[PDB]
Amino acid sequence: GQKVHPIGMRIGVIRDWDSKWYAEKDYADFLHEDLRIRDYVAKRLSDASVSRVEIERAANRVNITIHTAKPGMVIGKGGSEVEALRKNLNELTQKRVHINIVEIKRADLDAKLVAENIARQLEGRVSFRRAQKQAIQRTMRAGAKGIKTQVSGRLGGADIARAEHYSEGTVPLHTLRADIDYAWEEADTTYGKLGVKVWIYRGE
RNA sequence: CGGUAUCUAACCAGAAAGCCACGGCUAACUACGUGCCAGCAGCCGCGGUAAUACGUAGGUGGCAAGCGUUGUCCGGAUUUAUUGGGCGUAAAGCGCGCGCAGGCGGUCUUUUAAGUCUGAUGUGAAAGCCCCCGGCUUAACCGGGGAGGGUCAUUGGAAACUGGAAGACUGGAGUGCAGAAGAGGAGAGUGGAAUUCCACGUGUAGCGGUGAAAUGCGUAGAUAUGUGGAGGAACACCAGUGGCGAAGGCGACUCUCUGGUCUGUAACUGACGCUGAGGCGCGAAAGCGUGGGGAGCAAACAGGAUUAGAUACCCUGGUAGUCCACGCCGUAAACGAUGAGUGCUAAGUGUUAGGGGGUUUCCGCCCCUUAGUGCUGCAGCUAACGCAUUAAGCACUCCGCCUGGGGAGUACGACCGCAAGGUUGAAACUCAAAGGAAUUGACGGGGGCCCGCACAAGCGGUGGAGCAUGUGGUUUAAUUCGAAGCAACGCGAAGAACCUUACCAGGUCUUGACAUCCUUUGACCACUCUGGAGACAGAGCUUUCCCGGGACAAAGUGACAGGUGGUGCAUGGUUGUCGUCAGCUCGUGUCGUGAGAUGUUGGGUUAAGUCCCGCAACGAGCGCAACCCUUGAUUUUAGUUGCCAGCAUUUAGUUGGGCACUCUAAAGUGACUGCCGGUGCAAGCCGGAGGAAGGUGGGGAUGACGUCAAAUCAUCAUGCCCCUUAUGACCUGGGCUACACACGUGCUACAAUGGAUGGUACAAAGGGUCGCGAAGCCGCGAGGUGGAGCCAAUCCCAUAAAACCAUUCUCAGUUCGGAUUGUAGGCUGCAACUCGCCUACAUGAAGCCGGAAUCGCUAGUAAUCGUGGAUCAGCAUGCCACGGUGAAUACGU
Ligand SMILES: [Mg+2]
Ligand SMILES: [Mg+2]
Ligand SMILES: [Mg+2]
Ligand SMILES: [Mg+2]
Ligand SMILES: [Mg+2]
Ligand SMILES: [Mg+2]
Ligand SMILES: [Mg+2]
Ligand SMILES: [Mg+2]
Ligand SMILES: [Mg+2]
Ligand SMILES: [Mg+2]
Ligand SMILES: [Mg+2]
Ligand SMILES: [Mg+2]
Ligand SMILES: [Mg+2]
Ligand SMILES: [Mg+2]
Ligand SMILES: [Mg+2]
Ligand SMILES: [Mg+2]
Ligand SMILES: [Mg+2]
Ligand SMILES: [Mg+2]
Ligand SMILES: [Mg+2]
Ligand SMILES: [Mg+2]
Ligand SMILES: [Mg+2]
Ligand SMILES: [Mg+2]
Ligand SMILES: [Mg+2]
Ligand SMILES: [Mg+2]
Ligand SMILES: [Mg+2]
Ligand SMILES: [Mg+2]
Ligand SMILES: [Mg+2]
Ligand SMILES: [Mg+2]
Ligand SMILES: [Mg+2]
Ligand SMILES: [Mg+2]
Ligand SMILES: [Mg+2]
Ligand SMILES: [Mg+2]
Ligand SMILES: [Mg+2]
Ligand SMILES: [Mg+2]
Ligand SMILES: [Mg+2]
Ligand SMILES: [Mg+2]
Ligand SMILES: [Mg+2]
Ligand SMILES: [Mg+2]
Ligand SMILES: [Mg+2]
Ligand SMILES: [Mg+2]
Ligand SMILES: [Mg+2]
Ligand SMILES: [Mg+2]
Ligand SMILES: [Mg+2]
Ligand SMILES: [Mg+2]
Ligand SMILES: [Mg+2]
Ligand SMILES: [Mg+2]
Ligand SMILES: [Mg+2]
Ligand SMILES: [Mg+2]
Ligand SMILES: [Mg+2]
Ligand SMILES: [Mg+2]
Ligand SMILES: [Mg+2]
Ligand SMILES: [Mg+2]
Ligand SMILES: [Mg+2]
Ligand SMILES: [Mg+2]
Ligand SMILES: [Mg+2]
Ligand SMILES: [Mg+2]
Ligand SMILES: [Mg+2]
Ligand SMILES: [Mg+2]
Ligand SMILES: [Mg+2]
Ligand SMILES: [Mg+2]
Ligand SMILES: [Mg+2]
Ligand SMILES: [Mg+2]
Ligand SMILES: [Mg+2]
Ligand SMILES: [Mg+2]
Ligand SMILES: [Mg+2]
Ligand SMILES: [Mg+2]
Ligand SMILES: [Mg+2]
Ligand SMILES: [Mg+2]
Ligand SMILES: [Mg+2]
Ligand SMILES: [Mg+2]
Ligand SMILES: [Mg+2]
Ligand SMILES: [Mg+2]
Ligand SMILES: [Mg+2]
Ligand SMILES: [Mg+2]
Ligand SMILES: [Mg+2]
Ligand SMILES: [Mg+2]
Ligand SMILES: [Mg+2]
Ligand SMILES: [Mg+2]
Ligand SMILES: [Mg+2]
Ligand SMILES: [Mg+2]
Ligand SMILES: [Mg+2]
Ligand SMILES: [Mg+2]
Ligand SMILES: [Mg+2]
Ligand SMILES: [Mg+2]
Ligand SMILES: [Mg+2]
Incomplete structure (x- = not known):
């Protein structure tokens, strides 16, 4: 049995799509x-634990906000790394680009950030059983009513691939008033390719 | 022996380390090579292009002057069990009895001293094991002393136990006396139902048989029916986990001859007993010999059916046999799969044959007790099932039997038999299992409830024809690759003339068509001419960068790039399918030696493990339901590009005017078993009212744990393998469109509910800026010119078609059908031959409802008719959406 994408099922119902701009005859020009x-933000800020990026476009002006769990690298004492963004975005956007940075409180509740922390351990030769369990017990203290995660692929170096999942709490997928986050990430190993799936039933 | 052992003097780290294993058993793991090959192995078993198991290295682990392998013996092996096993179902109780030898044997007294216990003497050599000392520089090794070792011989004691002898007793055993029950056995005779045959009345055409039939019997008169005769076998009701017997077994009645058992008494004897190898007898059915008998039944056999075949099941006949006398045979799932004797160890309740007591006149009820026969259950036992005073519990005596499976109850030998065969009973070889009980699933041509267009009741199709399209096969330089029952086959492909294109022919390039870092200029090109099929080769105009920075470009080099090359059985992600089926699990608790179980089962109800009640369980999660969208009714907000009530005007809702009504879209109401009646205890069920809507209203989105090593390395990503002057890169042409053929999916028809001609009405949902494209004019037509308006509730696409109204055709291969083909055109595109779509004229094919088989659909559904959109320069009979008209049937499982 195949499951619908939990995020996609809720667009326009309870959540709102990331890129929120309106234009006609410039749709494909703006969209790409x-x-x-x-693509560029996900390249330079690979280790900054960046999860949510949205685009706010209005009359030849590009407004972008960055949701970061640890903005100290993105902004703070240096005060010069964030300005390089506007200098490294003017060449391809060709538009006056302003960037905003927003703190993420309780970073363990965000399904995006949990995903790579599980993933980063898999190529650190950590057992798959331990990595998922450690993240499950960390998020439950944050205030989530549900979590279940699986890791699938050539598991622990095994020749035959299989999937393993661990759950505790309440994760009702079919409910539409759920507010369930989702994330999928790649674990680059020397025996193959692994992927992790995480979805969290948030509080409200 | 022999200048041997042994001392002291000096020089030298210098001459002196190998063997086996590293998956588990079992201490010790990583690389490379190979690729079910080479090979390894004591067992389990490893090797099929990431091997801790094969080969070699590095490292490690056991020992060490060694280390491994083979052969033999003991151990582990309780696997011959005296210490120390067993026989209900795993191997294992003879089919049963009578009994010689042997083994074992109630209570007491006296005696004896064979067994039993004990002392002394003699001996059991030396060496060896063991204990205590001592010598070799230690040890091994060697001495001294001691100990142990016997069913040993002589002799002295003890008398409890077994044995011997002499007596005594009665709880064992047996006799006597008084009763009782019984299909216990052998012999002789008799009875009644019923079947068959025979003879004679009555009578007419079938009888008999099967899932259906047929063979067979009958007009030579059957079946049926009434009367009489002959003969053989078994004994209806009674009849009962009732009775009798050692077992096999014994069922009509009477008599004769006979065996055993139970109860009561306490007269009698006084251990006279239990088991029992060899031996001797009995022993279902079939079978054998001799003489009878023969009604039904029936192996063999014959015929008829069934079947692909049917030496069978089914039907019609039928011989030995079954019955009797005598004599053999000696087996059985001969079973309670449980040897015989004895004693002890909770209860509850039926029944057979007796005895005692209390109530009562009897009857009857109750209690106690003996011997049988059943059921339920404690302790105990058991691997479990289960047994449980009729033990598979606790004990003692005697007999029989077993030691992994097959070979095999076979071969040879012997005994028995008339024969068939019986009894006794191996080995070579081969395997690492064979087996008992219970658990979770699956399966059934087992059973009980249920659901789905599953069948049934209907309607319309496919399979027959022509064309469209995908696939197979085949042909081709190539016909690029993938999918293969449902769940590939108008599928990836929501558009193959060049491109796409991944394939082929020819012509070309090697840091390259696409990115990074090198170094000099900084713009680099573009264009024109010539050879050009083009890619590309040779010349000129210009290359203006901007701000020491830069991205690209010029130039050659490297690191490098590039693969639609392989493996979907190395993978990530994505999807199908069972199936929108109602299930799948967990936490704690409890039961079981254990795998497991319970919850999740039982009684109702539901679309639903949806809910209620009960319950050794109490709760939870993913699923169901609801939350989401859409349609159906309505209120407020809002009147523009929408609408026109009431108006004046216009060819026309037009213009002026107004949101009245529709309308569009934001927010709300509304449907929740809400209410009433009956039914039920509750869930719920049936009906009714209100309402637009009533029982999850209609339709969508939503697809649980998992199964198919299901599909995709070709959307993308990616481990490993492979190619790299090519398996990478550019150009033209061809091909993916072939064609004796087979299959799937569609379109059009085979006409009168129809064809043709003329007039006219009624929609919804969408698209439009390098776009839609009107009026007007031209052409028979496809189309051409033209440019209005529209960045759109405004303008265009855009006249909806079936339907309705008139005329004509008159049942024919036709005024049906349109394939096919010749000519003449239009449109896109640089280009329409391979290979596009449309128009005009002419040609006019198969086809007159489709065999076997098979598909879809339950209401605005099927059926039928039009419209729009994605991909798109052009091209859809495909796909995805929209509306018009609008059925038949559902008894039922
Ligand atoms: Mg000398
Ligand atoms: Mg010396
Ligand atoms: Mg020295
Ligand atoms: Mg080990
Ligand atoms: Mg290897
Ligand atoms: Mg080994
Ligand atoms: Mg090796
Ligand atoms: Mg080595
Ligand atoms: Mg070593
Ligand atoms: Mg030594
Ligand atoms: Mg040796
Ligand atoms: Mg050996
Ligand atoms: Mg032994
Ligand atoms: Mg045994
Ligand atoms: Mg026994
Ligand atoms: Mg057996
Ligand atoms: Mg047996
Ligand atoms: Mg017996
Ligand atoms: Mg005797
Ligand atoms: Mg005695
Ligand atoms: Mg004796
Ligand atoms: Mg001696
Ligand atoms: Mg000494
Ligand atoms: Mg000695
Ligand atoms: Mg000595
Ligand atoms: Mg005595
Ligand atoms: Mg004496
Ligand atoms: Mg007596
Ligand atoms: Mg008798
Ligand atoms: Mg008799
Ligand atoms: Mg008679
Ligand atoms: Mg028939
Ligand atoms: Mg007659
Ligand atoms: Mg008896
Ligand atoms: Mg008698
Ligand atoms: Mg008698
Ligand atoms: Mg009796
Ligand atoms: Mg006496
Ligand atoms: Mg006896
Ligand atoms: Mg005998
Ligand atoms: Mg006989
Ligand atoms: Mg005979
Ligand atoms: Mg005879
Ligand atoms: Mg026959
Ligand atoms: Mg017969
Ligand atoms: Mg006889
Ligand atoms: Mg036999
Ligand atoms: Mg036998
Ligand atoms: Mg019997
Ligand atoms: Mg037996
Ligand atoms: Mg006994
Ligand atoms: Mg007994
Ligand atoms: Mg009894
Ligand atoms: Mg053997
Ligand atoms: Mg054997
Ligand atoms: Mg024999
Ligand atoms: Mg013989
Ligand atoms: Mg077995
Ligand atoms: Mg079994
Ligand atoms: Mg239906
Ligand atoms: Mg056809
Ligand atoms: Mg193909
Ligand atoms: Mg289709
Ligand atoms: Mg080409
Ligand atoms: Mg030039
Ligand atoms: Mg030139
Ligand atoms: Mg697969
Ligand atoms: Mg349902
Ligand atoms: Mg269960
Ligand atoms: Mg139930
Ligand atoms: Mg309901
Ligand atoms: Mg439920
Ligand atoms: Mg009511
Ligand atoms: Mg009603
Ligand atoms: Mg639902
Ligand atoms: Mg496969
Ligand atoms: Mg495949
Ligand atoms: Mg690849
Ligand atoms: Mg094709
Ligand atoms: Mg016509
Ligand atoms: Mg043409
Ligand atoms: Mg014509
Ligand atoms: Mg014809
Ligand atoms: Mg006709
Ligand atoms: Mg088109």
Whole structure:
């Protein structure tokens, strides 16, 4: 049995899609500009635990906000790394780009950030059983009513692939008033390719 | 022996370390090579292009002057069990009795001293094991002393136990006396139902048989029916986990001859007993010999059916046999799968044959007791099932039997038999299992409830024809690759003329078509001419960068790039399918030696493990339901590009005017078993009212744990393997469109509910800026010119078609059908031959409802008719959406 994408099921119902701009006859021109912007942000800020990026476009001006769990590298004492973004985005956007940075409180509640921390341990030769369990017990203190995660692929170096999942709490997928986050990430190993799936039933 | 052992003097780290294993058993793991090959192995078993198991290295682990392998013996092996096992179902109780030898044997007294216990003497050599000392520089090794070792011989004691002898007793055993029950056995005779045959009345056409039939019997008169005769076998009701017997077994009645058992008494004898190898007898059915008998039944056999075949099941016949006398045979799931004797160890309740007591006149009820026969259950036992005073519990005596499976109850030998065969009973070889009980699933041509267009009741199709399209096969330089029952086959492909294109022919390039870092200029090109099929080769105009920075470009080099090359059985992600089926699990608790179980089962109800009640369980999670969208009714907000009530005007809702009504879209109401009646205890069920809507209203989105090593390395990503002057890169042409053929999916028809001609009405949902494209004019037509308006509730696409109204055709291969083909055109595109779509004229094919088989659909559904959109320069009979008209049937499982 195949499951619908939990995020996609709730667009426009309880949540709102990330890129929120309106234009006609410039749709494909604007849309692929965003796909370029996201590609560069995900490159330089690979270790900054960045999860949510949205595009706010209005009359030749590009407004972008970055949701970061640890903005200290992104902004703070240096005060010069964030300005390089506007200098490294003017060449491809060709528009006056302003970037905003927003703190993420309780970073363990965000399904995006939990995903790579599980993932980063898998190529650190950590057992798959331990890595998931450690993240499950960390998020339950944050205030979530549900979590279940699986890791699938050539598991622990095994020749035959299989999946393993661990759950505790309440994760009702079929409920539409759920507010369930989702994230999928790649674990790059020397025996193959592994992927992790995490979804959290948030509080409200 | 022999200048041997042994001392002291000096020089030298210098001459002196190998063997086996590293998956588990079992201490010790990583690389490379190979790729079910080479090979390894004591067992389990490893090797099929990431091997801790094969080969070699590095490292490690056991020992060490060694270390491994083989052969033999003991151990582990309780696997011959005296110490120290067993026989209900795993191997293992003879089919049963009578009994010689042997083994074992109630209570007391006296005696004896064979067994039993004990002392002394003699001996059991030396060496060896063991204990205490001593010598070799230690040890091994060697001495001194001691100990142990016997069913040993002579002799002295003890008398409890077994044995011997002499007596005594009665709880064992047996006799006597008084009763009782019984299909216990052998012999002789008799009875009644019923079947068959025979003879004679009555009578007419079938009888008999099967899932259906047929063979067979009958007009030579059957079946049926009434009367009489002959003969053989078994004994209806009674009849009962009732009775009798050692077992096999014994069922009509009477008599004769016979065996055993139970109860009561306490007269009698006084251990006279239990088991019992060899031996001797009995012993279902079939079978054998001799003489009878023969009604039903029936191996063999014959015929008829069934079947792909049917030496069978089914039907019609039928010989030995079954019955009797005598004599053999000696087996059985001969079973309670449980040897015989004896004693002890909770209860509850039926029944057979007796005895005692209390109530009562009897009857009857109750209690106690003996011997049998059943059921339920404690302790105990058991691997479990289960047994449980009729033990598989606790004990003693005697007999029989067993030691992994097959070979095999076979071969040879012997005994027995008339024969068939019986009894006794191996080995070579081969395997690492064979087996008992219970658990979770699955399966059933087992059973009980249920659901789905599953069948049934209907309607319309496919399979027959022409064309469209995908696939197989085949042909081709190539016909690029993938999917293969449901769950590939108008599928990836929501568009193959060049591109796409992944394939082929020819022509070309090697840091390259695409990115990074090198170094000099900084713009680099573009264009024109020539050879050009083009890619590309040779010349000129210009290359203006901007701000020491830069991205690209010029130039050659490297690191490098590039693969739609392989493996979907190395993978991530994505999807199908069972199936929108109602299930799948967990936490704590409890039961079981254990795997497991319970919850999740039982009684109702539901679409639903949806809910209620009960319950050794109490709760939870993913699923169901609801929350989401859409349609159906309505209120407030809002009147523009929408609408026109009431108006004046216009060819026309037009213009002026107004949101009245529709309308559009934001917020709300509304449906929740809400209410009433009956039924039920509750869930719930049936009906009714209100309402637009009533029982999850209609339709969508939503697809649990998992199964198919299901599909995709070709959307993307990616481990390993492979190619790299090519398996990478550019150009033209061809091909993916072939064609004797087979299959799947569709379109059009085979006409009169129809064809043709003329007039006219009624929609919804969408698209439009390098776009839609009107009026007007032209052409028979496809189309051409033209440019209005529209960045759109405004303008265009855009006249909806079936339907309705008139005329004509008159049942024919036709005024049906349109394939096919010749000519003449239009449109896109640089280009329409391979290979596009449309128009005009002419040609006019198969086809007159489709065999076997098979598909879809339950209401605005099927059926039928039009419309729009994605991909798109052009091209859809495919796909995805929209509306018009609008059925038949559902008894039922
Ligand atoms: Mg000398
Ligand atoms: Mg010396
Ligand atoms: Mg020295
Ligand atoms: Mg070990
Ligand atoms: Mg290897
Ligand atoms: Mg080994
Ligand atoms: Mg090796
Ligand atoms: Mg080595
Ligand atoms: Mg060593
Ligand atoms: Mg030594
Ligand atoms: Mg040796
Ligand atoms: Mg040996
Ligand atoms: Mg032994
Ligand atoms: Mg045994
Ligand atoms: Mg026994
Ligand atoms: Mg057996
Ligand atoms: Mg047996
Ligand atoms: Mg017996
Ligand atoms: Mg005797
Ligand atoms: Mg005695
Ligand atoms: Mg004796
Ligand atoms: Mg001696
Ligand atoms: Mg000494
Ligand atoms: Mg000695
Ligand atoms: Mg000595
Ligand atoms: Mg005595
Ligand atoms: Mg004496
Ligand atoms: Mg007596
Ligand atoms: Mg008798
Ligand atoms: Mg008799
Ligand atoms: Mg008679
Ligand atoms: Mg028939
Ligand atoms: Mg007659
Ligand atoms: Mg008896
Ligand atoms: Mg008698
Ligand atoms: Mg008698
Ligand atoms: Mg009796
Ligand atoms: Mg006497
Ligand atoms: Mg006896
Ligand atoms: Mg005998
Ligand atoms: Mg006989
Ligand atoms: Mg005979
Ligand atoms: Mg005879
Ligand atoms: Mg026959
Ligand atoms: Mg017969
Ligand atoms: Mg006889
Ligand atoms: Mg036999
Ligand atoms: Mg026998
Ligand atoms: Mg019997
Ligand atoms: Mg037996
Ligand atoms: Mg006994
Ligand atoms: Mg007994
Ligand atoms: Mg009894
Ligand atoms: Mg053997
Ligand atoms: Mg054997
Ligand atoms: Mg024999
Ligand atoms: Mg013989
Ligand atoms: Mg077995
Ligand atoms: Mg079994
Ligand atoms: Mg239905
Ligand atoms: Mg056809
Ligand atoms: Mg193909
Ligand atoms: Mg289809
Ligand atoms: Mg080409
Ligand atoms: Mg030039
Ligand atoms: Mg030139
Ligand atoms: Mg697969
Ligand atoms: Mg349902
Ligand atoms: Mg269960
Ligand atoms: Mg139930
Ligand atoms: Mg309901
Ligand atoms: Mg439920
Ligand atoms: Mg009511
Ligand atoms: Mg009603
Ligand atoms: Mg639902
Ligand atoms: Mg496969
Ligand atoms: Mg495949
Ligand atoms: Mg690849
Ligand atoms: Mg094709
Ligand atoms: Mg016509
Ligand atoms: Mg043409
Ligand atoms: Mg014509
Ligand atoms: Mg014809
Ligand atoms: Mg006709
Ligand atoms: Mg088109």
